[PDB]
Assembly symmetry: D2
Homo-oligomer: 328 residues x 4
Amino acid sequence: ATLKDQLIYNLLKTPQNKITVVGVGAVGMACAISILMKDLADELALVDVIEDKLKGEMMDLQHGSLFLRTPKIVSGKDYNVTANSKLVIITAGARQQEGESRLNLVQRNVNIFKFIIPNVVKYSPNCKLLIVSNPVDILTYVAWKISGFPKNRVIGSGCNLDSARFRYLMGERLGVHPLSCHGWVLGEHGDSSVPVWSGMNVAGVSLKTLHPDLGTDKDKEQWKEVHKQVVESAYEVIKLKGYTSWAIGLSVADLAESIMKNLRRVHPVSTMIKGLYGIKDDVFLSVPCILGQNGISDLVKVTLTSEEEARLKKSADTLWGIQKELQF
Amino acid sequence: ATLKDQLIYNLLKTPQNKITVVGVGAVGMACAISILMKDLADELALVDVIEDKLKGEMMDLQHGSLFLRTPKIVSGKDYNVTANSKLVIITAGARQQEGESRLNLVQRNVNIFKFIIPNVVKYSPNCKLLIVSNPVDILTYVAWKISGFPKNRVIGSGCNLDSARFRYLMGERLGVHPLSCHGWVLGEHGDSSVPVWSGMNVAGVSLKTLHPDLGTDKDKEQWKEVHKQVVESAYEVIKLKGYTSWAIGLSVADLAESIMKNLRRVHPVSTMIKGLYGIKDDVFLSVPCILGQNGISDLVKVTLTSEEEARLKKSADTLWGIQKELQF
Amino acid sequence: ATLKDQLIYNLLKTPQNKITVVGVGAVGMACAISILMKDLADELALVDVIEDKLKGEMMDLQHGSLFLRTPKIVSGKDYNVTANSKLVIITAGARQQEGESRLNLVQRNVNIFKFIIPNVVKYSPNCKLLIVSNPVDILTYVAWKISGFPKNRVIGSGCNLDSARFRYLMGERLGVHPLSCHGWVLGEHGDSSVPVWSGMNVAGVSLKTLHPDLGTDKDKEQWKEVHKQVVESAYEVIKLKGYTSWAIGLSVADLAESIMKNLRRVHPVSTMIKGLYGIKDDVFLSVPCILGQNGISDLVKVTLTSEEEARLKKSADTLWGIQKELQF
Amino acid sequence: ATLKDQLIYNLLKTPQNKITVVGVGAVGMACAISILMKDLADELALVDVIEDKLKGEMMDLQHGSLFLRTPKIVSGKDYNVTANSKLVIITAGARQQEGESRLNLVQRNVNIFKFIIPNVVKYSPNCKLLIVSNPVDILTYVAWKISGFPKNRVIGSGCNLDSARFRYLMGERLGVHPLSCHGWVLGEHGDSSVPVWSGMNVAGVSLKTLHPDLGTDKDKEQWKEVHKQVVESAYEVIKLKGYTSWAIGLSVADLAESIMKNLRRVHPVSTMIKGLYGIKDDVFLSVPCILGQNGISDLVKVTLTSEEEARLKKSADTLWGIQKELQF
Ligand SMILES: NC(=O)C1=CN([C@@H]2O[C@H](COP(=O)(O)OP(=O)(O)OC[C@H]3O[C@@H](n4cnc5c(N)ncnc54)[C@H](O)[C@@H]3O)[C@@H](O)[C@H]2O)C=CC1
Ligand SMILES: O=C(O)c1ccc(CN2C(=O)c3cccc(NC(=O)c4ccc(Cl)s4)c3C2=O)cc1
Ligand SMILES: O=C(O)c1ccc(CN2C(=O)c3cccc(NC(=O)c4ccc(Cl)s4)c3C2=O)cc1
Ligand SMILES: O=C(O)c1ccc(CN2C(=O)c3cccc(NC(=O)c4ccc(Cl)s4)c3C2=O)cc1
Ligand SMILES: O=C(O)c1ccc(CN2C(=O)c3cccc(NC(=O)c4ccc(Cl)s4)c3C2=O)cc1
């Protein structure tokens, strides 16, 4: 009699919460570790093209995961290891080389997504796609087109992280914990993003109401400088460290939690926005979405000034400007 | 009247669970992110010598921490930012250059710790020191000597991770969840480490009792191959990826949780072992320790065979062999 | 040599997060179990006057706590077991007998607090007092007077639970998760409580803005019926079951979490409100407070209509009407 | 246009982790609150026969659940509200009247289960049955027979709580945290239960090995007194308080966690034991079981002395003694 059979009388013998991370660069692995440690998944699948490096990240993560609610953790160049994923996070992309045009970068990303997205869909046809790759508003559009998925199951990391950053500085200024502050940053991810002053409050007391010169240039307190420092903060990280990993990792884990645990929470994420704010093109921008187990179940219809509406409309034009030139 | 003063009537105006990570290489930051995400600390302090890279890791971690129970997160070249740390994790070290002697490497690590440890102690005199730097059993001794701390407040990452790995394979073989398996790997971290077959059980049913030829060469099932595959697993990670980060990060977070939340849990960690197993020298090896808010409160006196006892004794000799030559 | 000494080599030999629950009725024990299971306390102290019943609730709770992060759990008629409590929850009360006057009931509660509060203070002088006993806005005042504590360390359960209930129905009506809805119920706990329509939003989009006839009687959708159903819900529980336990238990655990884990979260809790809304008497009502490790660190100055302000002012009069008649 | 439609643009429109508690007495509700607070279930169903009291417990629990990851919470006299339960906890039964025979009580419990179990099965045919009702080892058998479920999907609360209690006192004696102690109490729940000395260890160091006169009468340290104090502790709760609620609540929540979150953890729970310890009858006793999402997946074959084996065998006889007389 074997030792197994002497010790254990056995009576009995598919994952329900599988997550795939595509790309195991800094960002991919930051997503992966941040998702493990929120115990969101019973199976975690890693996919990249450098095979020896992929298997090492899988093994290192496996070994650490022994100190958690350990899920199944698998990896491969072949997308068959991503089968029956509830959620697939795309981090894979090309980084812009110096003197490369915006349009040229997007097209190289498009040519990559033309290999990735059809393989993801082949093996996980009812998954939600969460797009992290930059520039995120266009690459969400790209993944939507290639996948043929409905708009609810294609989401971009969007302004989730920029909004968190905004609320931190909002908090520092009012002497209030960031989580007690509310306020969104919507539209095109980075630089062109719109701080929405109308809906910024603490405990439902509107800041616009108390200080009606809030967003404006004749603002004694200069709250414009907040949205400026949010965007500078993104760059100062890259200047000092070389890249950002942790910040996007946890921002994505936050979005993954809302989807995987069906929290029906509000995130300013890139979604198909044709119909709203007088935009007639198939562009994606960040507006507040309820995220649940079926992805974006609802949008929250934010009332924007004509200034705010124009700044979005201008972003939607720039974005369609590139999208119409892309070859699928 | 400012917007802050119009909105908020204030009534009121030191951290109790501060953790310092020394070194923000792969391992340091894996420790840091893994500690953030277990919400162990109200203040987290990062210290390294490359100033621009340090500040970037701090900022990136800060930004991500907006999606957690956000602690204070600070960084500096100067150790004054580590003041009143309950726990300090040392990851800083020298890596062995080509043709460099084992003794010479340890002495360079000694000369580094002669700058680090006195600065750590100056600013956090009642802290626990958790040593992760390799070779860990000697560098724990080094930190103990330089700090003049009692043996309870100086701990090495030790065989915590190797034991977890062992128990995983133990589990796979018995068809039992790793956390339902018990069994230690003690002594010198890596290669020379001793699987303790006497104390390996499931639900208190000793495996040694059911299959008395367990550890031996005449073992039909060849359980020796388990401890072999544990050590090969460490290397296969380094061959494939370049280094290990995640696995030690979470292994250290596990030890930090036991200390910071006073769990009084048992970990096989490097501690001063003079008195036991006929060892008369001031050497550190991994034996089961109860970890709590005062560090190592208790040892568990494991009864070892003459083989096991000799393999430890031999490691203690090798280690004192280097320790006696070091210049403080 | 004993078995303890053969097995365990000992190296070493005060709680930092002690909570006392005063009163082990339905409500007290609901508080206690709800606080245990959020692992908020390293020591839990139970105090009541029926000694045999007290010790049984302690033992039953002890035995269950073996399946949690087990704290120390103690009990006594003598308040010396409450020493060094960070938080003391008063649930002790008299229940109104048939034909007893409202004033007479409050005075019996006062005569009880005249024994409890000085004993609590004697043994835990830097604690926060959380008052749950009804009528809660007056008994918070009573505990404030007897304790001589500053207004920041004396808090009443207040409208925390009523506001939660409101937001649930708000959610059901908008097809939004309760936690994505914001909106307070302020003032005198129950019946006289004021739904604050100005500050009710989803994702910062004010409901008042979209539907300016919200609070009013000429409201097509009849949102007044929400605050009505909140108050009826309190009664329908007592009619059907005899009392409420679970609801106040978890409402108090929520407030305890904010204090014990220093979350600096906003709760509509009873606090000293002289200075605000043209109120010159020492009365307590529910306004939004930031709760942290020092109790109420901040108030949020909510802008109220003249109707809302008058309804509060009227409650403050009624309450001072009773407070001035009480004998200390 | 409604306020809902002005605020929310909707895109989209069954529970996967439903738990039913049958009986909302002290024990039932302690189970319910303890299960809510471990966030195990997306739907919780309460069933009892007193309709007005049932609806009050549901409402009180509903209101408290607003401070958690709020599940759906329903109740009814009709079992149709228990449809698609992954786990059903039976607390309903009869208490022994004065001068009533043991056999007569069990038969009245049988006649109740003949209404409950077929209704549970009708609406949740693939559920796991967790039996809490006393006497638990017989009523588990009763539920197994009536349900026609396989032995893996019928589990009794068993000696889970007695074993926890044992380990606490074991810990107090060795100066070790209860969770660092291992040791089972197996067999018939209460009084006749067998402390298994062979498999009692700390960190895999067997206590039997260090002190071979452990269980015996010639034990200088008198460890027999531990199992005595475990059983006296059960009674002293009932003498002092009237009943036990919290202890069984959390003991059941522990078992529910292992099943609902597929932890594959070891619990000494009542299961069909024909085949083991020379027992040829269909009796249920507590032996170590791996609990997962399909209930009892595996048993751990504990080696027992002839004394231990005889004490179980004697319990199995007494139990079959009653079981053979029951009318289905
Ligand atoms: N929403 C809310 O805020 C609600 C609050 N309550 C309050 O909770 C309080 C307690 O109600 P329950 O615990 O449900 O039932 P309860 O009224 O039976 O229990 C309260 C306990 O106070 C104890 N007590 C009396 N004098 C004492 C002293 N000198 N020292 C220590 N303890 C003493 C009693 O023995 C009793 O066990 C009541 O005063 C009531 O006002 C009740 C219902 C709703
Ligand atoms: O691609 C492979 O080579 C591969 C992939 C998955 C597996 C199975 N698997 C897990 O899903 C999984 C999850 C988490 C941990 C884990 N393994 C370990 O941690 C260890 C393996 C060997 C040692 Cl030693 S530790 C494993 C693991 O081995 C094995 C091999
Ligand atoms: O090294 C510095 O110069 C330094 C150190 C600490 C701090 C204070 N501080 C925290 O302690 C802390 C914890 C967590 C987050 C965090 N800041 C933020 O996430 C953001 C800052 C600026 C933006 Cl934009 S987001 C901060 C933060 O700014 C600021 C600057
Ligand atoms: O007042 C008393 O009679 C008293 C109070 C606390 C204690 C010590 N104590 C704890 O602080 C504590 C916390 C959690 C559990 C717990 N005890 C138990 O679970 C058991 C005691 C006896 C058995 Cl049997 S189990 C205890 C416990 O016994 C002992 C006696
Ligand atoms: O049996 C019934 O009568 C019944 C059953 C389910 C429901 C729907 N439902 C939940 O599933 C549920 C879960 C948790 C809370 C909850 N209700 C509430 O929180 C409140 C109702 C009214 C106020 Cl005020 S709060 C509910 C709730 O109302 C309503 C009535």
